[model samples]
Target chain A: NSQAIDNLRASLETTNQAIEAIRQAGQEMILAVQGVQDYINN
Target chain B: ERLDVGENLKKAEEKLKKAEELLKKSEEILKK
Candidate 1:
């Protein structure tokens, strides 16, 4: 049904958004680690 | 440069692999 498809699309979008948020958080954590390493070295 | 292209391609390949896995799972759900 069209409604099912719409629901699935909404769910997929939400999942994708969540995945993106996790990815960004991971990237930020890595950057923070690099910054800390630089501070330690300096 | 060639190096930039290689880096971009590697990243693209990784993301595509991830996206493909998600899509495969989505297709399975759709089939059910």
Candidate 2:
């Protein structure tokens, strides 16, 4: 049914959104770690 | 990434290819 495709697409979108959020969080953590390292050096 | 170009485009294109293939498989399953 078309409904199934719609559902699958919705699920994929949700999964992709979560993946993006995680990627952003990872980048933020990397920046935070670098900041901490710089603080220590200073 | 430039937010609208470069590596993101490549990554998105690669992902789009995979997603299209997967979506095609999904469409087949849906048509059944």
Candidate 3:
């Protein structure tokens, strides 16, 4: 039972979760900006 | 105990490296 491995695995998981959330948000922002561009193009 | 520390640190380093790659890939995708 290596607790240290589990501990850092937990840390890695959270870092990944945070990164995923931020990436999702960034995609949404790009969509929002593109929408504005399209609206102005018309 | 010492061996455990070394092993765990190595695993932790591996995980960190993977995480960094994932984040960097996402960043590059978002850049475009």
Candidate 4:
């Protein structure tokens, strides 16, 4: 395989993984914020 | 009052979803 192609693929994979991590973190952040909102309202 | 918070989160998630789709398409092109 071409080294450039391989490197590009690797980079894409890493970026995808990073995006996934951020997505999960965003989910957790929403949940945490919801809990805080609930505590405040109740 | 804070309803916009959820709305903003939805928008962000939607954008992220679009980004992922684009990335997958690029990966497929590289596969050929």
Best by TM-score: 4
Interface Cα root-mean-square deviation for all models: 7.6, 8.3, 18.9, 3.1
Best by lDDT: 4
Q: Clashing pairs in model 2?
A: none
Deviating ranges (above 4 Å) for candidate 4: B1-6, B9-32
The collision pairs in model 1 are: none
Give the fraction of native contacts in model 3. Answer: 0.00
Q: Taking the tens digit of each residue's C-alpha lDDT, what string does model 3 give over A1-42?
A: 566566556656656765765555555556655656666676
- Whole-model alpha-carbon lDDT for candidate 4: 0.73
Off by over 4 Å in 2: B1-32
**Which stretches of model 1 miss by more than 4 angstroms?**
B1-32
TM-scores for all candidates: the values are 0.54, 0.53, 0.54, 0.62
**What tens-digit string does per-residue lDDT give for candidate 2 at B1-32?**
11223344455455555655655655555454
Q: Give the distance in Å from residue B28's predicted Cα in candidate 1 to where it truly belongs.
A: 20
Q: Which of candidates 3 and 4 is the stronger one according to TM-score?
A: 4
Compose the digit string of candidate 2's lDDT tens values, residues A1-42.
Answer: 888778777666655654564565556556656656666676
Error of 1 at A11 (Å): 0.6
- Report the lDDT tens digits of candidate 1 across residue range B1-32: 11123343445456556666666666655555
Which DockQ values do the candidates obtain, in the order shown? 0.05, 0.04, 0.02, 0.32
When sorted by TM-score, best at the front, the candidate numbers are: 4, 3, 1, 2
